[PDB]
């Protein structure tokens, strides 16, 4: 057989490549915040909650995965911290990257008390809280659900172990029924159904506004249609009526509403006297109001809400390349669980498997580059000076 140290030598590159890119990239993603004060906000308090996750990545996480992969001997519970490790940055992850996707929503459901209800200081104690868990749920083996019981002894005197030493293999004291069940079901797959569920809802809450808005706008255009052309002298009654709670109803959502309600108050009050032809001249005068003030409205409105849903389309990226990378590892530990018949994955598919959810640490700094036009100014300022 062919030597394990050349087949080990591309392995360790690509993994110490990926160790520096993680490193470089998320630095600047601190950096920009720690800046640009427009930056500073809840979300991307989570981001750099994110981003520093990925960094212990490359400092610790991607050096251990090297250090398993000569198969070292070691004690076991040594041992099982290098090989679980990873997991408690992979479970900060996602506690961060459903915290990112809740304020999306907060946001965009309730925007009249976000401020009131999302907190600087109370995202730095969920932050803190959340760290804390992934501690607990990423080390659980060491709580004593692990395989240290039971040791291969044969693998460990093959290999010259020392008492109470065993050689080190993820597989071998991590048990697979905690990968499959505990980390991935419950604390992997469950939590990224709730994000792709809360996603769901940004989506449908922003199409809704958009509609509700343009409601608004086509009720206000068609019984300004309606009033010039009325039969009964009070017609125009019914088409003001519905007019002035359809002004509230957008003045409700987000100077020149005083102005417009005013103005349709006073064919109202025509109206009431029979006067028709002279109610259908003053109703004209809303014309002259809306394209001055109402259609700006409508129009910075629906632009805020693009700029949000973009926003939430960029989050959305990032929660979908963090399955993208980790889903085959956790698939691959699903088969050897579920079929001890199967034909295990080769050792090449493995370490591409390990290197893809790696590669999770790099692609965060270039979405907020490429997405987010405040972020890619400040890293341009960074390297520039
Ligand atoms: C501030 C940062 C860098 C601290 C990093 C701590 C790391 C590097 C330390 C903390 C606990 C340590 C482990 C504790 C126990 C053992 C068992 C021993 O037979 C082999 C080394 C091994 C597996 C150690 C490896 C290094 C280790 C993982
Ligand atoms: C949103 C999606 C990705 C949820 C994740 C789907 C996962 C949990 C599903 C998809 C494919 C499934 C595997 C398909 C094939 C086999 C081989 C069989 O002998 C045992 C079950 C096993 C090993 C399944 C385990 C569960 C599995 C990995
Ligand atoms: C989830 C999206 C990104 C697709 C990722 C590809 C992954 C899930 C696919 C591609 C190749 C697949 C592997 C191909 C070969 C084997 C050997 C077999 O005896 C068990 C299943 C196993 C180990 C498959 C597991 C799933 C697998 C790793
Ligand atoms: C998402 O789950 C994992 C996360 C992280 C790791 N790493 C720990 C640190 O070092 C690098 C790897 C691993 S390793 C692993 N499965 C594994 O080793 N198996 C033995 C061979 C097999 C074909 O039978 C399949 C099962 N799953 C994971
Ligand atoms: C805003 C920044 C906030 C930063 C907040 C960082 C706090 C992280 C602390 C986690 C400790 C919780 C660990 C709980 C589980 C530990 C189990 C364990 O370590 O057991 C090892 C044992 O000694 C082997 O024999
Ligand atoms: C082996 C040792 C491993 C040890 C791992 C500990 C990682 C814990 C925290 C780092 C991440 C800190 C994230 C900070 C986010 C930014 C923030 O909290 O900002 C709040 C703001 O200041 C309010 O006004
Ligand atoms: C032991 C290992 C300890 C963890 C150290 C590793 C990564 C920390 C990365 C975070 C670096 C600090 C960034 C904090 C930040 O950017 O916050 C600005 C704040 O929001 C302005 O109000
Ligand atoms: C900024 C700070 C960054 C800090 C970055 C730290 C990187 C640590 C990574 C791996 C160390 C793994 C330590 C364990 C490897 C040696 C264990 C060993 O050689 O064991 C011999 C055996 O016990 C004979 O019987
Ligand atoms: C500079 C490079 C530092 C990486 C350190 C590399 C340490 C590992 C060297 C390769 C090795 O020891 O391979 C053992 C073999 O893979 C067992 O099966
Ligand atoms: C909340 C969870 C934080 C965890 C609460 C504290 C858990 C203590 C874990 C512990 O003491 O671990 C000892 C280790 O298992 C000896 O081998
Ligand atoms: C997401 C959650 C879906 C979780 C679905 C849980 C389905 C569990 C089925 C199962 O665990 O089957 C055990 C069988 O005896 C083989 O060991
Ligand atoms: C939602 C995904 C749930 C996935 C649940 C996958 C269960 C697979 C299973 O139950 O496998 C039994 C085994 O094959 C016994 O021979
Ligand atoms: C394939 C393209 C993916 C890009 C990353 C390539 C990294 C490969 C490292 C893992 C495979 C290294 C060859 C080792 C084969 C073996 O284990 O015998
Ligand atoms: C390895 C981990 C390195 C993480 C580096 C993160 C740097 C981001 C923020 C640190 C705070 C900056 C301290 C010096 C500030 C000086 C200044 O304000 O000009
Ligand atoms: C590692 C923990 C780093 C925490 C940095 C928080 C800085 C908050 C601030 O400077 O206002
Ligand atoms: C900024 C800090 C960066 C830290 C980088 C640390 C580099 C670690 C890389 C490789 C170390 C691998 C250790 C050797 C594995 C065990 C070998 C053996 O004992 O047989
Ligand atoms: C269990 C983990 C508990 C951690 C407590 C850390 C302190 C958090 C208190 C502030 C919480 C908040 O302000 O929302
Ligand atoms: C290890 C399995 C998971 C363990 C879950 C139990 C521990 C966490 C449960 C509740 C912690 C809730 C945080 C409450 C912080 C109080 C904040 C405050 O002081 O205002
Ligand atoms: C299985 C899960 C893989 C699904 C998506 C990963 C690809 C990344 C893009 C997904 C987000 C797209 C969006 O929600 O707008
Ligand atoms: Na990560």
């Avoid at 009654?237 to 509230?248: I, Q, S, V, Y």
């Avoid at 993208?324 to 050897?336: A, D, E, S, V, Y």
Wanted: aromatic share 10%.
């Amino acid at each position: 057989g062919a030597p394990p140290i050349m087949g080990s030598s591309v392995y360790i590159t690509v993994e110490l490549a990926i160790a520096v890119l993680a490193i470089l990239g998320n630095v600047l993603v601190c950096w920009a915040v720690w800046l640009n004060s427009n930056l500073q906000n809840v979300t991307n308090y989570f981001v750099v909650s994110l981003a520093a996750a990925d960094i212990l990545v490359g400092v610790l996480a991607i050096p251990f995965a090297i250090t398993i992969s000569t198969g070292f001997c070691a004690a076991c519970h040594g041992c099982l911290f290098i090989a679980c490790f990873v997991l408690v940055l992979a479970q900060s992850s996602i506690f961060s990257l459903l915290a990112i996707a809740i304020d999306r929503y907060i946001a965009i459901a309730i925007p009249l008390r976000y401020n009131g209800l999302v907190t600087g200081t109370r995202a730095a104690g969920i932050i803190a809280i959340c760290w804390v868990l992934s501690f607990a749920i990423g080390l659980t083996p060491m709580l004593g659900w692990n395989n240290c019981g039971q040791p291969k002894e044969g693998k460990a005197h093959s290999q010259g172990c020392g008492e109470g030493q065993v050689a080190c293999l993820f597989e071998d004291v991590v048990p697979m029924n905690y990968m499959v069940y505990f980390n991935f079901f419950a604390c992997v797959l469950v939590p990224l159904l709730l994000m792709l569920g809360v996603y769901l809802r940004i989506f449908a809450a922003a199409r809704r506004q958009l509609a509700d808005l343009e409601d608004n706008w086509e009720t206000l255009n068609d019984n300004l249609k309606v009033i010039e052309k009325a039969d009964n002298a009070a017609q125009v009654k019914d088409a003001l009526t519905k007019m002035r709670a359809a002004a509230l109803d957008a003045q409700k959502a987000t100077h020149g509403f005083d102005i417009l309600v005013g103005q349709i108050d006073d064919a109202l009050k025509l109206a009431n006297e029979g006067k028709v032809k002279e109610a259908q001249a003053a109703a004209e005068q809303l014309k002259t109001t809306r394209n001055a003030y109402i259609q700006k409205y409508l129009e910075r409105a629906r632009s805020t809400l693009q700029k949000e849903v973009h926003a939430a389309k960029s989050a959305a990226i990032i929660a979908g390349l963090f399955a993208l990378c980790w889903l085959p590892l956790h698939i691959i530990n699903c088969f050897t669980f579920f079929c001890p018949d199967c034909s295990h994955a080769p050792l090449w598919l493995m370490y591409l498997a390990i290197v893809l959810a790696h590669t999770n640490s790099v692609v965060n700094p270039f979405i907020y580059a490429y997405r987010i036009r405040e972020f890619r100014q400040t890293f341009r300022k960074i390297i520039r000076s």
